[PDB]
From Swiss-Prot:
It is an enzyme of class 3 (hydrolase). Keywords: Antibiotic resistance, Hydrolase, Plasmid, Signal. InterPro entries: Bact_Transpept/Beta-Lactamase, Beta-lactam/transpept-like, Beta-lactam_class-D_AS, PCN-bd_Tpept. It comes from Klebsiella pneumoniae. This is Beta-lactamase OXA-48.
Length: 242
């Protein structure tokens, strides 16, 4: 069921980094990773939490649809793309934390906790501040656990409406061409050691789906582009994308 392929480590070491890629072949129900241990180590989800957060916000009516505009609060932040109005699509695209912090406040601790348990999401522990627990609270999730959650979302099996799941998968759209579609979400965890980057999602092919979840050491923001680059090198090596 699970196979370890340490040859992928070359893709990390060549960039003087360390991390894990986890792949799941949906048709064959087989998983692949370069590091079985790290594949099952639990990290802060950081902005990958915008997937479950979006689902919950939509299903509870906190977010009406993917067109609703969340006005900039007028507080100048250091990420320029955050200092503007957003909808669900652009808020996902630019990882607009303050928009999702307000979602969490409106969801509230009780419903957030109840929903993460229904999702079987990570350690399901929202201890910490309701508007930041996915950044510096007690919640943790592994790369293999990200896959399990994403597979439920792909199949509309999470305990929210089909509509909520379709909208979030639309908002997860990252890349599409004649060969594949990638739906995914990046993450960047800095408040609790070790600092890491995430990229989780899936690759849709004509006749199969490959789920993926990777995290990697991220001592500075200079390496953030390696999250996608390393994942794609693994995908290319396994002949999943040209
Ligand atoms: C480059 S910089 O401007 O020096 N600092 C900086 C840049 C980007 C981010 C960020 C925030 C949320 C999510 C993500 C993500 O990639 O998923 C990235 C944080 C700090």
């Amino acid at each position: 069921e699970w196979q370890e392929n340490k040859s992928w480590n070359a893709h990390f070491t060549e960039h003087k980094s360390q991390g894990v890629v986890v792949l799941w072949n949906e048709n064959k129900q087989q998983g692949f990773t370069n590091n079985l241990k790290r594949a099952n180590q639990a990290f802060l989800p950081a902005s990958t939490f915008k997937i479950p957060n979006s689902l919950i916000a939509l299903d509870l009516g906190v977010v009406k649809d993917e067109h609703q505009v969340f006005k900039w609060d007028g507080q100048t932040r250091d990420i320029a793309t955050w200092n503007r109005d957003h909808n669900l699509i652009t808020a996902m695209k630019y990882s607009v934390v303050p928009v999702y912090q307000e979602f969490a406040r409106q969801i509230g601790e009780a419903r957030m906790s109840k929903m993460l348990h229904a999702f079987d999401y990570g350690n399901e522990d929202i201890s910490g501040n309701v508007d930041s627990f996915w950044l510096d609270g007690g919640i943790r999730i592994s790369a293999t656990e990200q896959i399990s959650f994403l597979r439920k979302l792909y199949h509309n099996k999470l305990h929210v409406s089909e509509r909520s799941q379709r909208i979030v998968k639309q908002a997860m759209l990252t890349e599409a061409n004649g060969d594949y579609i990638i739906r995914a979400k990046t993450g960047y965890s800095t408040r609790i050691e070790p600092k890491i980057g995430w990229w989780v999602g899936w690759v849709e092919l004509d006749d199969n789906v490959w789920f993926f979840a990777m995290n990697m050491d991220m001592p500075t923001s200079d390496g953030l582009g390696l999250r996608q680059a390393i994942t794609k090198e693994v995908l290319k090596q396994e002949k999943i994308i040209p």
